Amino acid sequence: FQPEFVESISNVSVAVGRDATFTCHVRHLGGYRVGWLKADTKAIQAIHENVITHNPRVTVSHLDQNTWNLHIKAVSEEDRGGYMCQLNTDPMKSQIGFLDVVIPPDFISEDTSSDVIVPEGSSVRLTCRARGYPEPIVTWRREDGNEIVLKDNVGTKTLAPSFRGEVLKLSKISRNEMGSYLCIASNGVPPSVSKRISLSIHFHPVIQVPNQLVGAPLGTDVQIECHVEASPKSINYWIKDTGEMIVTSGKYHVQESSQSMYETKMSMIVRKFQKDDVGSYRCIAKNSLGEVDSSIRLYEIPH
């Protein structure tokens, strides 16, 4: 008889850092040798039990004269390609097997965006690119969970919880669209990678005052309110007409309240209105771009 094999050896996908093995199922091996060589480089890997290549990750093993294995420990991208076991018959016979090496995603830092500070109303592009095999997919999300504004043309705009694409086009920006966005790159190979990108929209603080005139009967508690719209968030406080700051005490009670990143509802209560409390009170909002005040007049409702 002549040495022949059965069943073949089959292709293998594995991904980096992991081990891999190719196996040939021979019969009637006799006095012939089974050798391996990398198909594309034509580099002899092994013959029988001897290892020829000085690639350390490469080993051989066998339990009988029937099944012969080639092992790659923690495969790399250079290891991918063909692996041929051959019997040294004349002419020689050979099985061929292909090692497919997938790689997890990794960002192209030169292409991924940084934190941006865009002016309200303009258009912005957010970019995330990652290399990997297979081709990674980039999906964008808002970190707080809200939807992303998706516009096209100039008269059609929808909303979506996520967007797929390496470049996220946000045109005609509004105050609402500020905040952290997330791009994640997934190729189906763990681990996927993400990056947090902070879209900033900045403006002067703006104060709206419902009721700039409040009437109090002596001895009651009256609340005056200011509504601030500022970005970045403003540091706020109330101030006496003379020029003295109000902080919460037994007489006063100051509070703030944020409906969003750029909205704040500041309120002050003055307990037990007296002839001493009559006058105007200013609410002041300051951020890095500027500061603005507004004045509320408190008057007495007589007898």
Ligand X SMILES: *[C@@H]1O[C@H](CO[C@@H]2O[C@@H](C)[C@@H](O)[C@@H](O)[C@@H]2O)[C@@H](O[C@@H]2O[C@H](CO)[C@@H](O)[C@H](O)[C@H]2NC(C)=O)[C@H](O)[C@H]1NC(C)=O
Kindly list the residues in this chain that would bind a copy of itself in the complex (CB under 8 A).
32-33, 35, 37, 39, 41-44, 47, 52-56, 78, 84, 86, 88-92, 94
d(CA 171, CA 123): 4
Task: State the binding partner of 53 from ligand X, a copy of itself, none, CB within 5 to 8 A by kind.
Answer: a copy of itself
Minimum Å distance from CB 186 to ligand X? 23
Shortest gap between Cβ of 37 and a copy of itself (angstroms)?
7
By a kind-dependent CB cut-off of 5 to 8 A, residue 52 interacts, out of a copy of itself, ligand X, none, with a copy of itself
- Which residue's CB is nearer to a copy of itself, number 92 or number 117? 92
Among 2, 4, 7, 11, binds ligand X (CB under 6 A): 11
**Sheet containing 263-270, strands listed edge to edge, beginning at the edge strand earlier in sequence:** 203-208, 222-231, 263-270, 252-255
Nearer to a copy of itself, 89 or 139 (CB): 89
Distance CA 200, CA 212 (A): 32
- Closest approach of Cβ 42 to a copy of itself, in Å? 6
Q: Is 259 in the site for ligand X (CB under 6 A)?
A: no
Structural contact between residues 120 and 203, judged by C-beta atoms closer than 8 angstroms: yes
Part of the chain binding ligand X (CB under 6 A), chosen from 3-11, 62-70, 231-239, 277-285? 3-11
Nearer to ligand X, 100 or 293 (CB): 100
Q: Kindly identify the residues of this chain, within the stretch 95-114, that bind ligand X according to CB under 6 A.
A: 98, 100
> Among candidates 115, 124, 133, which has minimal Cα distance to 185?
133
Query: Which residue sits closest to ligand X, CB atoms considered?
Result: 98
Integer Cα distance of 200 and 264 in angstroms: 17
**Closer by beta carbon to ligand X, 9 or else 230:** 9
With CB under 5 to 8 Å by kind, the binding choice for 295 among a copy of itself, ligand X, none is none
> Which residue number, 92 or 160, has a Cβ lying nearer to ligand X?
92
Residue closer to ligand X by CB (options 10, 176) is 10
Greatest alpha-carbon span in the chain:
125
Q: With CB under 6 A as the contact rule, which of the stretches 7-15, 115-123, 219-227, 259-267 interacts with ligand X?
A: 7-15
Q: How far apart are CA 238 and CA 234, in angstroms?
A: 13
196 vs 74: CA distance, rounded Å: 31
In the complex with a copy of itself, which residue's Cβ is closer, 95 or 112?
95
Span from 5-13, 110-118, 187-195, 279-287 in contact with ligand X (CB under 6 A): 5-13
Choosing from 8, 208, 255, 274, the residue that interacts with ligand X (CB under 6 A) is: 8
Interface with ligand X (CB under 6 A) = 8, 10-11, 98, 100
